[PDB]
Amino acid sequence: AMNPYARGPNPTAASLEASAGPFTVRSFTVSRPSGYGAGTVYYPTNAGGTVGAIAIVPGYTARQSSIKWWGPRLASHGFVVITIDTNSTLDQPSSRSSQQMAALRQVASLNGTSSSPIYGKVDTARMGVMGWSMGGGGSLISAANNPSLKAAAPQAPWDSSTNFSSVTVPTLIFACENDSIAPVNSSALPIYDSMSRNAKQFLEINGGSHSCANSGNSNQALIGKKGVAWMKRFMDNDTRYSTFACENPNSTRVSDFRTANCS
């Protein structure tokens, strides 16, 4: 049956691995950030309908630059994306989560503000969370606390606690094989194994350092394909993307692939 959220032409591996999707992207800096430090909004000009929104948070000491590449990559496939700086560079995961949710809230405000470039462009019922390291831990906290979120795709997550057993939101964990800041054995993998209630996926990048999914990474084709496919499948209920979302990509750039409850 027709999916009112489907946007864009039918996907291929090549179209998803490309540096950009079908839609023209513009961006702006949020003038008066509400509940977080600073933000940049990326949006499609010509998506053909309202789109979901995704809020992305950096790691400790880090800024938007570390996660910026997701903004154009996701927006060009039909999402509104807000990348944030935190109130302090030394904010911890819980605070990062609150700020992430504040950023989504502001996206909803701007959707209703006629002066904004994103006026009327957002479906405020359909949201997702992403982020690096402690910002990835924050993303998981956001999902735990707000199960109406449609998707979560943290990268190299870290939190003091690895128990996210309550999470019912579809969650893709990007992991970095050689991470020594948040080692996979003590962070990303126990987090992944804790979650028994959801669609989930574990994608570990072969030879990756802790920054393996950050801006400038050497795996933007694969990582971008997977992120976009996960968000399309789960934020847009778009079953054109189910295979790309759920499949083992059979890539030598991947040292560990796992998934559950994905169809």
Author numbering: -1 to 261
Sentences from the paper on this structure:
Specifically, I. sakaiensis adheres to PET surface and secretes a unique cutinase-like enzyme that degrades PET. By hydrolyzing PET, the enzyme produces mono-(2-hydroxyethyl) terephthalic acid (MHET), TPA and bis-2(hydroxyethyl) TPA (BHET). The enzyme is named PET hydrolase (PETase) for its PET preference. PETase adopts the canonical ɑ/β-hydrolase fold, in which the strictly conserved catalytic triad S131-H208-D177, as predicted from sequence alignment with homologous enzymes that exhibit PET-hydrolytic activity, is found on the protein surface.
The recombinant protein of wild-type PETase without signal peptide was expressed and crystallized in the orthorhombic space group P212121. The structure was solved at 1.58 Å resolution, and three polypeptide chains were observed in an asymmetric unit, which are denoted A, B, and C chain. S131 serves as the nucleophile and is located within hydrogen-bond distance to be polarized by the base H208, which is in turn stabilized by the acid D177. First, PETase forms two intra-molecular disulfide bridges (DS1 and DS2) while the other homologous enzymes have only one. The strictly conserved DS2 (C244-C260) connects the C-terminal helix and the last loop, while the PETase-specific DS1 (C174-C210) links two loops that harbor the catalytic acid and base. Second, W156 adjacent to the catalytic center displays variable conformations in the crystal structures. Interestingly, an equivalent Trp is found in every PET-hydrolyzing enzyme, but W156 wobbling has not been observed before. Among the surrounding amino acids a distinct S185 is found in PETase, which is consistently replaced by a His in the homologous enzymes. Further analyses indicate that a His side chain would be too close to allow “A” or “B” conformer of W156 in PETase, while a Ser residue can yield a space to accommodate the “C” conformer of W156. The apo-form enzyme provides a shallow cleft for substrate binding onto the protein surface, with the W156 side chain in various conformations.
